Structures are given as C-alpha cells and as structure tokens.
C-alpha cells in the first residue's frame, strides 16, 4: 500500500506568480513504472516521469488553470496510486450574448458560460436605475436553466413595456464572482 504526500490546496488570486503543485511518494513495496499529472480527469502533456517526487508548475495561473489535479503513480506489477490537489480560482465568464433583438410575443434566450473551479452558482439580474436587481417571475414568463458551467435565461411572450433592458448573469463561487450583461431590445 503506497503512500503519497501532497502540497496544500491552492487558491489562485492573480496571474503574476507561478504556483507549484507537489506530490511525494514516501513509501512503496513496488518499483515505479511511471508517474504523471492529470487535470480534471485528463492527463497533462509531458508529465510522465519516473520520479517519486513530482512537481507541476502553473505559469501565469488563471481561472482556466483551476480544477482538481491528480498525481498518478503507475507501478510495475501493482495497481496505480494517486493523490489529489485542488486548485481553486474565481469564475471567469467566457461566453455570452452582447445583445438580443426579438419581437413582441417571441421568446428571448440569453446565456453565459464560465470556466473556473469550484463550479459557480448562477444568478440573473436586471439593471434598473444603475443597480442590478433580482428578476421577478410574478408573470411566470421567466425560465432559468442552471448547470455547472452554464446558465440560460429564457423570457417567453416578450412584452415591450416590461422586458427590454440590461440583463446580467453573475457567477459566484467561494473564491469570487464574475458578471457580464446582455442588452435585450424588443420590437414590433
Ligand atoms: C517533496 O520532497 C522534497 C524533498 O526532496 C521537498 O522539497 C518537498 O517539501 C516535498 N513535498 C511535500 C508536499 O511534502
Ligand atoms: C417562473 O414561474 C413558472 C410557473 O411557476 C415556472 O415554470 C418557472 O420555473 C419560474 N421560473 C423560475 C426562474 O423560477
């Protein structure tokens, strides 16, 4: 039963300083065939080395670099072993609609996509009087689909009096928040 010690959980705050992840194989009854690093379940490029003490350097760390990292140890004649290091960052919203123009009675569809771990929670707001406030569904016309890295707001039966304006999506996790906005224009 092999033993692996790791460096501590990493919280990314900005992109200046590199961050280094470490795993040390501290006990083994089997010869090491090789060890590598994975990120979010996928092997990282050129990390396969035959070293008990592994390091992974993240240069210019960003939200894209966050996730669950594993140092994996493949043994000759024995099952693999791994340990986990979490690298956390504030969300980054990577996709949205800048604007949407629809007709009265049609449906509006707005969305946002994020990168960052832990996956964010999402909220939609509308800008009124310079302040982004919570969206009322008193009308029953607002539908929100929230996934881990994606949110979607649908507004059915568009009304030109009430619906136009600036809508923003806010992605929040324990590290921080990000938001972007979409302008909705209703016509006809
Ligand atoms: C890994 O082992 C080397 C000792 O050569 C040391 O620099 C480092 O502190 C160790 N890392 C951890 C997480 O124990
Ligand atoms: C808005 O109200 C309708 C009817 O209760 C419901 O289908 C829908 O899920 C609500 N939207 C949200 C964001 O809760």
UniProtKB/Swiss-Prot annotation:
Expression sites by tissue: Isoform 1 is ubiquitously expressed. Isoform 2 is brain-specific. In brain isoform 2 is highly expressed in hippocampus and cerebral cortex and weakly in cerebellum and lower brain regions. In the hippocampus isoform 2 is found in the dentate gyrus and CA1-CA4, the striatum oriens of CA3 shows the higher level.
Highest rank taxon of the organism: Eukaryota
Glycosylation sites: 24, 50, 82, 137, 149, 170
Region (Narpin): 3-15
Subcellular location as annotated: Cell membrane
Extracellular side, ranges: 1-187
Reported modifications of this chain: Isoform 1 and isoform 2 are N-glycosylated.
Domain (Ig-like) ranges: 2-88, 91-181
SS bonds (residue pairs): 23-71, 112-169
Free-text function comment from the UniProt entry: Probable homophilic and heterophilic cell adhesion molecule involved in long term potentiation at hippocampal excitatory synapses through activation of p38MAPK. May also regulate neurite outgrowth by activating the FGFR1 signaling pathway. May play a role in synaptic plasticity. Also acts as a chaperone for ATP2B1; stabilizes ATP2B1 and increases its ATPase activity. Promotes localization of XKR8 at the cell membrane.
Domain notes: Some isoforms lack the first Ig-like domain which may confer homophilic adhesion activity. However, they can bind and activate FGFR1.
Complex formation: Interacts with ATP2B1; this interaction stabilizes ATP2B1 and increases ATPase activity; this interaction controls T cell calcium homeostasis following T cell activation. Interacts with XKR8; promoting its localization at the cell membrane.
Protein name per Swiss-Prot or TrEMBL: Neuroplastin
Source organism per UniProt: Rattus norvegicus (Rat)
Gene: Nptn
Residue numbers of the full-length protein present here: 147 to 333 of 393
């Amino acid at each position: 039963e092999p033993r692996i010690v790791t460096s501590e959980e990493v919280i990314i705050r900005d992109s200046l300083l590199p961050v280094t992840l470490q795993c040390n194989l501290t006990s083994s009854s089997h010869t090491l065939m090789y060890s590598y690093w994975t990120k979010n379940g996928v092997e990282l490029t050129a990390t396969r080395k035959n070293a008990s003490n592994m390091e992974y350097r993240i240069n210019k760390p960003r939200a894209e670099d966050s996730g669950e990292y594993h140092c994996v140890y493949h043994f000759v004649s024995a099952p693999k072993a791994n340990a986990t290091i979490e690298v956390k960052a504030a969300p980054d919203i990577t996709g949205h609609k800048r604007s949407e123009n629809k007709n009265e009675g049609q449906d509006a569809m707005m969305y946002c996509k994020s990168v960052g771990y832990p996956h964010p929670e999402w909220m939609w707001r509308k800008k009124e009087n310079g302040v982004f406030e919570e969206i009322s569904n008193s009308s029953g016309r607002f539908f929100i689909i929230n996934k881990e890295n994606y949110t979607e707001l649908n507004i059915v039966n568009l009304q030109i009096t009430e619906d136009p304006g600036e809508y923003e999506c806010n992605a929040t996790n324990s590290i921080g928040s990000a938001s972007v906005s979409t302008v909705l224009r209703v016509r006809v």
